[PDB]
Amino acid sequence: ETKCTLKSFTVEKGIYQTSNFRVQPTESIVRFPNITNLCPFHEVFNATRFASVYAWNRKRISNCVADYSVLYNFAPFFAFKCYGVSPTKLNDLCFTNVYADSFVIRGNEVSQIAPGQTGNIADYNYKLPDDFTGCVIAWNSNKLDSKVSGNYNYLYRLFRKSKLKPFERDISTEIYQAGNKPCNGVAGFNCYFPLQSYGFRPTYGVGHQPYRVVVLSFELLHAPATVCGPKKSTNLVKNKCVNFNFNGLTGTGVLTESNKKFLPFQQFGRDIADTTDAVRDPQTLEILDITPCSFGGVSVITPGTNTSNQVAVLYQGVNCTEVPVATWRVYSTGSNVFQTRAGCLIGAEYVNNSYECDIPIGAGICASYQTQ
Amino acid sequence: TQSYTNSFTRGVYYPDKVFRSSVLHSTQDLFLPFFSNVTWFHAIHVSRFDNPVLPFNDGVYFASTEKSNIIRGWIFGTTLDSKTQSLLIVNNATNVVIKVCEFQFCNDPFLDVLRVYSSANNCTFEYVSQPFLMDLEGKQGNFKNLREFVFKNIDGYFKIYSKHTPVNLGRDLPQGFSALEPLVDLPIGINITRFQTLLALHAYYVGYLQPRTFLLKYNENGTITDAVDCALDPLS
Amino acid sequence: SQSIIAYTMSLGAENSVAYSNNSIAIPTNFTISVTTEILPVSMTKTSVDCTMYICGDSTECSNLLLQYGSFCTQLKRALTGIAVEQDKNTQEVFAQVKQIYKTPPIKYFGGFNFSQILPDPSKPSKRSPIEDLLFNKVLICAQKFNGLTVLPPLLTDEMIAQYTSALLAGTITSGWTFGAGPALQIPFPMQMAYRFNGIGVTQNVLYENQKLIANQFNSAIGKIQDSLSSTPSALGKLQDVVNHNAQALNTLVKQLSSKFGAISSVLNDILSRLDPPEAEVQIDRLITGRLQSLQTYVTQQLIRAAEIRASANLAATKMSECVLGQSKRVDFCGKGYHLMSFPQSAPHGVVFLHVTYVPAQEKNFTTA
Amino acid sequence: DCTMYICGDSTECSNLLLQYGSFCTQLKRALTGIAVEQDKNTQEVFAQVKQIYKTPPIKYFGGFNFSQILPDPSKPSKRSPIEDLLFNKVLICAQKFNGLTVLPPLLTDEMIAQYTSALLAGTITSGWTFGAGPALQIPFPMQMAYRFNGIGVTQNVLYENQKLIANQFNSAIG
Amino acid sequence: LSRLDPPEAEVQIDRLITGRLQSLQTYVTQQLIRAAEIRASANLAATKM
Ligand SMILES: *[C@@H]1O[C@H](CO)[C@@H](O[C@@H]2O[C@H](CO)[C@@H](O[C@@H]3O[C@H](CO)[C@@H](O)[C@H](O)[C@@H]3O)[C@H](O)[C@H]2NC(C)=O)[C@H](O)[C@H]1NC(C)=O
Ligand SMILES: *[C@@H]1O[C@H](CO)[C@@H](O[C@@H]2O[C@H](CO)[C@@H](O)[C@H](O)[C@H]2NC(C)=O)[C@H](O)[C@H]1NC(C)=O
Ligand SMILES: *[C@@H]1O[C@H](CO)[C@@H](O[C@@H]2O[C@H](CO)[C@@H](O)[C@H](O)[C@H]2NC(C)=O)[C@H](O)[C@H]1NC(C)=O
Ligand SMILES: *[C@@H]1O[C@H](CO)[C@@H](O[C@@H]2O[C@H](CO)[C@@H](O)[C@H](O)[C@H]2NC(C)=O)[C@H](O)[C@H]1NC(C)=O
Ligand SMILES: *[C@@H]1O[C@H](CO)[C@@H](O)[C@H](O)[C@H]1NC(C)=O
Ligand SMILES: *[C@@H]1O[C@H](CO)[C@@H](O)[C@H](O)[C@H]1NC(C)=O
Ligand SMILES: *[C@@H]1O[C@H](CO)[C@@H](O)[C@H](O)[C@H]1NC(C)=O
Ligand SMILES: *[C@@H]1O[C@H](CO)[C@@H](O)[C@H](O)[C@H]1NC(C)=O
Ligand SMILES: *[C@@H]1O[C@H](CO)[C@@H](O)[C@H](O)[C@H]1NC(C)=O
Ligand SMILES: *[C@@H]1O[C@H](CO)[C@@H](O)[C@H](O)[C@H]1NC(C)=O
Ligand SMILES: *[C@@H]1O[C@H](CO)[C@@H](O)[C@H](O)[C@H]1NC(C)=O
Ligand SMILES: *[C@@H]1O[C@H](CO)[C@@H](O)[C@H](O)[C@H]1NC(C)=O
Ligand SMILES: *[C@@H]1O[C@H](CO)[C@@H](O)[C@H](O)[C@H]1NC(C)=O
Ligand SMILES: *[C@@H]1O[C@H](CO)[C@@H](O)[C@H](O)[C@H]1NC(C)=O
Ligand SMILES: *[C@@H]1O[C@H](CO)[C@@H](O)[C@H](O)[C@H]1NC(C)=O
């Protein structure tokens, strides 16, 4: 490795740095609350009547177990575009608050429901924010949501004075003002009806039929999570380098015990470096302290290829007693372990004599190729 | 009957739900400025009522020292009419009957020489829970309990913080420091711009918040003990 | 009854001299004084790892760290060079003597009192009282968990004191000879007579006024400890170095929590909330931001190390000239005529105690 | 100033200046350190004397002529003739309107001349003694004799050849 | 800021900000390097005085 890090077949006498080492995690643990009640998703997708376009039926999903697999009972899925998050990882996530908006449109405008897009539905009926996160779903409903004479229940806005700000219903039967005649409710020439109706019949085709669309909006931030995926809980392990997934807080640690005095309304913990330090167990409601995982560089002490081919390692600032990483099989060599202030020295003895210094190490110690 | 006084150093609340110790963290948010002008309202009808509707903007700091249950509830919303959506809060002995039912009239006292929500048509979210206004009595009236509340709403949700202080012993808005622990954070999407208070038959402060930058100090127990403004004085 | 008052800067007391054709002024008394000088010698060694810092424990992020050439085989070399020169600085400053000398058992030097600077065997640390005061007037684990490591110097602060003790014991029983050839013994009053003979004063002045000179030296050395312990900021140069290094590390580690025009500042969050194929957009922004934030730190460190090497060189020169001999340069080894100097260690620095000669009482005369 | 330079008087631009960490709390510190050391440099160079000395009224130093370097009371600036030549051989507002400010030094060029005058008046009536202890008077020819005695030349050379040396000095300074 | 609306205006502004940040960091570094070599001369001037 020393010959590889610096391009040569002959390394001069001295000390060199090659690479780093880190302790490796052993097992994975997942902790979730006892909440088991299913979410009302199965009702919002499977309903009888949907609202109009200008007045959508916004719903808020409270705390429950959400299974993002029941919605797959709907086969077609004309569009399943997810913007903020990847759909595949939708199951293994936790959200703060979830909004669902369901309504019905025509095919030619199904592509219009997206951030940063303009038109008639996207400007006069429903505008999404540019930084929107969530998913959109659309399916075909011509065969069971149409009449031979047609359905005129659904109407969409066509004329508006000003651009619609995102997430703003505009239910208002105000007569359009055009031309130069101040209409006072005449609703005649130059004063149009803002809402125009639809007609749905089984004789139409794709792009001329009603499609049912539902949009889900999320928000991810440090807050008590109410909606979570159906991932199974696990057990608790302490004083061992493990990776944890506490309610969205994922990362490696040791998870010792703590003596902190968290207030009853606090959840997380921080430090002067704005890094997570302490956590509150979702189920047992105790306080755990998260200290990171032993890591550090390594060094090789060589007397030079001209003399010999025997080396020693200088694991920087890790205790030999517990974690000397115990791959080139030089670990805890018999009678070759020395615990100095610099770190773990493997491959050299420690005599009680004193000579001049050849290869400095640290805190005052020197290595040499002295003969017996 | 409106009197005026000095708000002193008051109205500091925990901005986030995290734990910090021995930190000098500084944050920018809606706060009550130091040494602001607080209006001491006054009314009495125990000799209908003698108070019009107060304006609401950027939240309200509300403090009072009542006897047992004289002042109970609050009314929020626009125009306080049964055409728009309004919020009601009533604090009785055992529960809170907070609701977002639509109403315009909810009180027919008729003091001699309930009738709550007289017209409630289309109700909405309810959050019945433990009562807010509770007091402990040491069988002496030397120390009058002081109750402080902060109401605000930003990007959804209704944030209500509160604190009790038995330290007061005869002064209005005393010198000292006391942070407010969060109590209620419930979700409502209605639009609020007008504010009024209730009163029980058979003392009243109003403030206003502004966007300011504060610097707060935490102790080793995680409790805020001091805070400084960054616009009041050049030394600050 | 106080208020802030603004005035015009002054320059000093107006003085007038009475120069004439035949008029001279000669002093009739002297005054031995002790000055003090403080010099930084070295900062704290440090090392930074790119991979753990820029792309924490993520092979997906580490793969994208390529296509940037080798921007991290040079930062390591620069930091290693800085650490090596930091190790060399103290070796240059202190290791001026080939051997180690021991203080004599019986301490009696013509009446002079050196107990304030000689090692005290009572305390196990084996340090002079002045060094104790210097050691008592001059978040850590968080940086350890981000790839920033702090290395120990290759001279523990228990053999540096040995070097200082050897120098100070050689300079009181051998004069300046031990800096050129073999050490040669000489009584202390004779050495002071020789030092007086080097600033144009005959030696008979010393031997006729010895008790007074010894008392003046003792009084001068007595109050320097009080002045050091009572001045609000005397060791103000070393603390500036420590504060600058701590602030640099703090502002480097704080930069990790910045969006840099990306959705989040956490690699785990972006790696779990999004799929690979479009995830190499935010990661690039984070990598670029962190690369700039680390290059700035390295450049600042190089610039700061230059100005501390430029001071370590001066400290070495002052040790070679003021201590191992007598310096004729004006106003170099302290104000006034120079007699001798003593070194003392301090955390990442040295403190020189200069002994200087100053005339006291003038008298007018007529000359031809 | 970062804000006026990078995003001139535009709150919309200033909002985007975040998400870059603190890249402008360090430039201010660096520039402040540079300014402080610039102020310290001249203080270190010039302020070598604790007191301020005055030139004697009657000027006659063994025949030497110092009028070319001593302050001239005729000009109100109180500067030597040589300093006048040095001062006469060594778009501005546009930079002021971009956030780049120029600060004045904390020594006006009318008390630096006082420091130089004090040094030069001390060095001709006291020799080198005023740099170590109290200033002591001494005639100028005696001082030159002492200075000759310091380069391995006996003093009797000076006192036997004085007018010639004075003329050579005057011609050299001219 | 006047010819375009906010929502897509945060594209050119980023380029301007980046360019100006680099152009100012270069100036600061040059100033530090130049100040070092003038301090190194002020010290010599003080010694010579
Ligand atoms: C040259 O300067 C030295 C230092 O000041 C002079 O020595 C000091 O002389 C004064 C005058 O007597 C002493 O003050 C008195 O001393 C007696 C001693 O018992 C004391 O009882 C009085 O309360 C008062 O302090 C002073 O002690 C003495 N300094 C020392 C260290 O002994 C010296 O006299 C001067 N030379 C000439 C020729 O005047
Ligand atoms: C040396 O002699 C000169 C001249 O006699 C002294 O200077 C005078 O001192 C007296 C007494 O204080 C003053 O009244 C005069 O005004 C001084 N003359 C001038 C031109 O300044 C001088 O003080 C004597 N030296 C010492 C040390 O006293
Ligand atoms: C040298 O100075 C030290 C400190 O001033 C002297 O130590 C003091 O000695 C006196 C008398 O013996 C004691 O009353 C003090 O308590 C001592 N102080 C300390 C801090 O120990 C020492 O005696 C002096 N040396 C000689 C030879 O007199
Ligand atoms: C010192 O030198 C100056 C300048 O050379 C002399 O000033 C000149 O004096 C002569 C005769 O008095 C005049 O003709 C010149 O016009 C003067 N020149 C200037 C620029 O003023 C001065 O006289 C010399 N000092 C003495 C004592 O002779
Ligand atoms: C959908 O709902 C109807 C009634 O609301 C019910 O009869 C039907 O079984 C449901 N089907 C699915 C797949 O949920
Ligand atoms: C979850 O259930 C366990 C089993 O009874 C119980 O000990 C624990 O307190 C419960 N936690 C919550 C948050 O309901
Ligand atoms: C050691 O280096 C010298 C240098 O030229 C070389 O000649 C010699 O062969 C080397 N030793 C061995 C064993 O190769
Ligand atoms: C290893 O050393 C560290 C510090 O030197 C210490 O904290 C730790 O307890 C040691 N290991 C054991 C098993 O004692
Ligand atoms: C060397 O010193 C160590 C530390 O005191 C001690 O444990 C060891 O026994 C010594 N070895 C010998 C041979 O004296
Ligand atoms: C508060 O406002 C009133 C009305 O202008 C004014 O009279 C009073 O002085 C103000 N309070 C203070 C402390 O200035
Ligand atoms: C308080 O209100 C709750 C909720 O309506 C009610 O059940 C309870 O009886 C009330 N108690 C009193 C004393 O009015
Ligand atoms: C309240 O509900 C009734 C019936 O549920 C409805 O007729 C009325 O329009 C509603 N009020 C509104 C929507 O303002
Ligand atoms: C709230 O209602 C008032 C009055 O109807 C209106 O002026 C204001 O714009 C509304 N605010 C919001 C956020 O809807
Ligand atoms: C922290 O709480 C403990 C527990 O009662 C108490 O003893 C200590 O005084 C408190 N310290 C502070 C600063 O509040
Ligand atoms: C000094 O010498 C000059 C030159 O002759 C003379 O003019 C002056 O009067 C003398 N002053 C004294 C005090 O002797």
Residue ranges of domains in chain B, CATH in brackets: 3-236 (2.60.120.960)
Tell the burial category of B55 from Cβ atoms under 10 Å away from its Cβ (0-12, 13-18, 19+).
exposed
Any idea of the CA torsion for D9, D15, D20, D25, to the nearest 10 degrees?
A: 50
Nearest to E1 among D10, D17, D20 (CB): D10
Q: At what angle do helices C236-254 and C282-318 cross, to 10 degrees?
A: 170
Contacts of D110 in chain C (CB under 8 A): none
C350: exposed, middle or buried (Cβ count in 10 Å: 0-12, 13-18, 19+)? buried
Ligand nearest to C-alpha D57: 2
Q: Which run of H or of E encompasses E44? A: helix E12-48
Q: How far apart are CA B180 and CA C314, in angstroms?
A: 59
Q: Which residues of D60-99 are buried (b: 16+ CB within 10 A; e: fewer)?
A: ebbebbbeeebbeeeeeeebbeebeeeeeeeeeeeeeeee
Q: Provide φ and ψ at E38, rounded to 5°.
A: -85, -35
Task: List residues in chain B that are followed by a break over 2.5 Å (C to N).
Answer: 47, 113, 202
CB under 8 A, 24+ apart: contacts of B138-142: B142/B169
Nearest to D12 among E6, E14, E35 (CB): E6
Please write down the HEC assignment for all residues of chain C. CCCCCCCCCCCCCEEECCCCCCCEEEECCEEEEEEEEEEECCCCCEEECHHHHHCCCCHHHHHHCCCCCCCCCCHHHHHHHHHHHHHHHHHHHHCCCCCCCCCCCCCCECCECCCCCCCCCCCCCCCCHHHHHHHCCCCHHHHHCCCEEECCCCCCCCCHHHHHHHHHHHHHHCCCHHHCCCCCCCCHHHHHHHHHHHHCCCCHHHHHCCHHHHHHHHHHHHHHHHHHHHCCCCCHHHHHHHHHHHHHHHHHHHCCCCCCCCCCCCHHHHHHHCCCCCCCCHHHHHHHHHHHHHHHHHHHHHHHHHHHHHHHHHHHHHHHHHHCCCCCCCCCCCCCEEEEEEEEEECCEEEEEEEEEEECCEEEECCC
**Elucidation technique:** cryo-EM
Report chain A residues touching chain E, CB-CB < 8 A. Answer: 116, 130
Helix (H, G, I), strand (E, B) or coil at D125: helix
The CA distances from residue C9 to A364, C95, C240, D54, E23, in Å, are 53, 46, 27, 19, 39
Which residue in chain A is spatially nearest to B188 when comparing CA positions? A60
Cα separation, C276 vs B193, in Å, equals 46
- CA-to-CA distance for A290 and E15, rounded, in angstroms? 40
Chains A and C: how many Cβ contacts under 8 Å? 64
Q: How close is the Cα of B32 to the center of ligand 13, in Å?
A: 23
d(CA A276, CA C57): 17
- Counting other chains too, the contacts that A171-174 makes at CB distance below 8 Å and 24 or more residues apart are A171/A54, A171/A55
Which of A218, A261, A267 has the highest number of chain B CBs within 10 A, making it the mutation to test binding with B?
A261
**CB of B45 closer than 8 Å to CB of B212:** no
Which amino acid belongs to residue A251? G
How far, in Å, CA of C82 to CA of C76, rounded?
10
DSSP D78: -
- Count of pairs with CB atoms under 8 A, one residue in D, one in E: 49
Q: With contacts defined as CB-CB under 8 Å, which chain E residues touch A130?
A: 7
Residues with CB under 6 A from ligand 15: C 20-21; D 60
CB atoms within 10 A of CB D21: 19
Q: How far apart are CA B198 and CA B66, in angstroms?
A: 13
Residues of E in contact with D20 (CB under 8 A): 17, 21
Contacts of E8 in chain A (CB under 8 A): 116
Contacts of E9 (CB under 8 A, 6+ apart): D12, E1
C23/D contact by beta carbon, under 8 A: yes
- Chain D closest-CA separation from residue C69 CA (Å): 24
Read off the tokens for E6. 């906010």
What DSSP string describes B18-39?
EE--S---EEEEEEPPTT-EEE
Residue entry with tokens 């107060």: B54
Asked if D12 and E31 come within 8 Å (Cβ–Cβ), the reply is no
Contact call for C17 and D137, based on CB within 8 A: yes
CB contact under 8 A, B222 and A262: yes
Q: N- to C-terminal Cα distance for chain D?
A: 50
DSSP state letter for B168: -
Q: Are strands A242-246 and A28-29 parallel, antiparallel or unpaired?
A: parallel
The β-bridge relationship of strands A94-95 and A227-228 is antiparallel
Find out whether C184 and C101 touch, Cβ atoms under 8 Å: no
Nearest bound ligand to CA A72?
5
CB contact under 8 A, B18 and A269: yes
* Tokens of residue D142, six digits: 């005696």
Which H helix or E strand runs over E13?
helix E12-48
Contacts with C155 (C-beta within 8 Å, 6 or more apart), sequence order: A364, C90, C91, C94
Type of residue at A215: V
Q: Under a CB-based contact definition with an 8 Å cutoff, are residues B227 and B12 in contact?
A: yes
CB B60 within 8 A of CB B75: no
Q: What is the enclosing helix (H) or strand (E) of E21?
A: helix E12-48
Chains with ≥3 Cβ pairs under 8 A against D? C, E
Distance CA C322, CA C342 (A): 9
Q: Is B23 on the interface with A (CB under 8 A)?
A: yes
| CB-neighbour burial class of residue B12 (10 A; exposed 0-12, middle 13-18, buried 19+) | buried
Atom 10 of ligand 13, nearest CA residue: B191
Question: Which residue in A297, A296, A260, A264 sits closest to A276, CA to CA?
Answer: A260
Q: How do beta strands A249-253 and A242-246 pair?
A: antiparallel
Which residues share a beta bridge with A134?
Answer: A217
D115/C contact by beta carbon, under 8 A: yes
- Minimum Cα–Cα distance from A168: chain B residue: B189
Which of these, B60, B104, B61, lies nearest to B82 by C-alpha position?
B104
Closest residue of C to E21, CA-based? C292
Asked if E33 has any chain C CB less than 8 Å from its own CB, the reply is yes
Judge if the beta carbon of residue D65 lies within 6 A of ligand 4. yes
Q: Report how many Cβ contacts below 8 Å link chain A to chain B.
A: 41
Contact E14 C296 (CB under 8 A): no
Dist. CA C19–CA B49, nearest whole Å: 98
Q: Would an 8 Å CB–CB cutoff place D52 in contact with chain E?
A: no
Minimum distance, in Å, between the CA of residue B148 and any CA atom of chain A: 18
Helices C75-94 and C160-173 pack at an angle, to 10 degrees, of 30
Long-range contacts of E37-45 (CB under 8 A, 24+ apart): E38/D41, E39/C307, E39/D37, E39/D41, E40/C310, E42/D41, E42/D44, E42/D45, E45/D45
Q: Would you say the CB of residue B94 lies under 6 angstroms from ligand 14?
A: no
Q: Which amino acid residue places its CA nearest to atom 28 of ligand 4?
A: D65
Q: Do chains B and D touch (3 or more CB pairs under 8 A)?
A: no
CA–CA distance, C94 with C349 (Å, rounded to integer): 11
CB-CB neighbours of A231 under 10 Å? 15
Tokens of D165: 């040396």
What backbone phi and psi angles, to 5 degrees, belong to A67? -105, 110
Contact E17 D10 (CB under 8 A): no
Inter-chain contact B187–A60, Cβ cutoff 8 Å? yes
Query: How far apart, in Å, are the Cα atoms of C87 and each of A360, A361, C152?
Result: 10, 11, 10
Quick one: which ligand is closest to D81's CA? 4
Specify the DSSP element, H or E, that contains B185: strand B179-186
Helices (H), chain D: 2-6, 11-16, 27-46, 81-87, 92-96, 112-125, 140-148, 156-160, 163-173
Give the separation between CA B134 and CA A284, rounded to whole angstroms: 30
Which chain E residues have any C-beta within 8 angstroms of a chain A C-beta?
7-8
Nearest to E29 among C261, C299, C307 (CB): C299
D39 phi, psi to nearest 5 deg: -65, -35
Q: How far is CA C109 from CA B85, C207, D116, in A?
A: 97, 14, 46
- As a whole number of angstroms, the longest Cα–Cα distance in chain A is 114
Question: How far, in Å, from the CA of A280 to the mean position of ligand 6?
Answer: 14
Angle separating helix axes D112-125 and D27-46, nearest 10 degrees: 30
CB burial class (10 A; 0-12, 13-18, 19+) of residue C195? Answer: buried
Residue E41, H or E segment: helix E12-48
Instruction: Say yes or no: D26 contacts chain C, CB-CB below 8 A.
Output: yes
Residue C305: name the closest of C80, C121, C62 by CA.
Answer: C80
Backbone angles phi, psi at D145, to 5 degrees: -65, -45
Phi, psi of B132 (to 5 degrees): -85, -50
Torsion angles phi and psi, residue D94, rounded to 5? -65, -40
- Distances in Å between the Cα of C312 and the Cα atoms of C164, C245, C316, C317 are 16, 17, 6, 9
Q: What is the 3-state secondary structure (H, E, C) of chain A?
A: CHHHHCCCCCCCCEEEEEEEEECCCCCEECCCCCCCCECCHHHHHCCCCCCCCCCCEEEEECCEECCCCHHHHCCCCCECCECCCCHHHHCCCEECCEEEEEEEEEHHHHHHCCCCCCCCHHHHCCCCCCCCCEEEEEEECCCCCCCCCCCCCCEEECCCCCCCCCCCCCCCCCCCCCCCCCCCCCCCCCCCCCEEECCCCCCCCCCCCEEEEEEEECCCCCCCCCEECCCCCCCCCCCCCEEEEECCEEEEECCEECCCCCCCCCCEECCCCCCCCEEECCCCCCEEECCCCCEEEEEEEECCCCCCCCCCEEEECCCCCCCCCCCCCCCCCCCCEEECCCEEEECCCCCCCCCCCCEECCCCCEECCCCC
Q: What is the resolution of this structure in A?
A: 3.5
Give the ligand with the smallest distance to the CA of B220. 14
What angle in degrees, to the nearest 10, is found between the helix axes of C282-318 and E12-48? Answer: 0
- Are C273 and A362 a contacting pair at CB < 8 A? no
Test E25 with C261 for CB contact under 8 angstroms: no
Task: Return d(Cα D174, Cα D166) in angstroms, integer.
Answer: 12
* Token output for A117: 């897009």
Q: How far apart are the first and last CA of chain C?
A: 59
Angle at C103 between CA C100 and CA C106, to 5 degrees: 155
Q: Do B230 and B215 touch, CB atoms closer than 8 A? A: yes
Q: Find the closest chain A residue to C139 by CA distance.
A: A272
Taking the C-alpha atoms of residue B104 and residue B99, their distance in angstroms, rounded to an integer, is 14
Q: Provide Rg for chain E, Cα atoms.
A: 21
What is d(CA C21, CA D138) in angstroms, rounded to the nearest whole number?
A: 8
Phi, psi for residue B9 in degrees, rounded to 5: -105, 100
Cα separations in angstroms, C281 against A60, A84, A141, C287: 32, 14, 38, 10
- Any idea which residue has 């560089």 for tokens? A297
* Main-chain dihedrals φ then ψ at residue D126, nearest 5 degrees: -140, 0
Query: Three-class SS of residue B162?
Result: strand
Kindly list the residues from chain A whose CB atom is less than 8 angstroms away from the CB atom of residue B22.
272
Nearest 5°: phi and psi at A266?
-90, 150
Pocket residue to mutate for ligand 1, from C208, C209, C212, C361, most atoms within 8 A of Cβ: C212
Terminal Cα distance for chain B, rounded: 35
φ/ψ of C352, rounded to 5, equals -105, 135
Q: How far, in Å, from the CA of A296 to the mean position of ligand 8?
A: 16
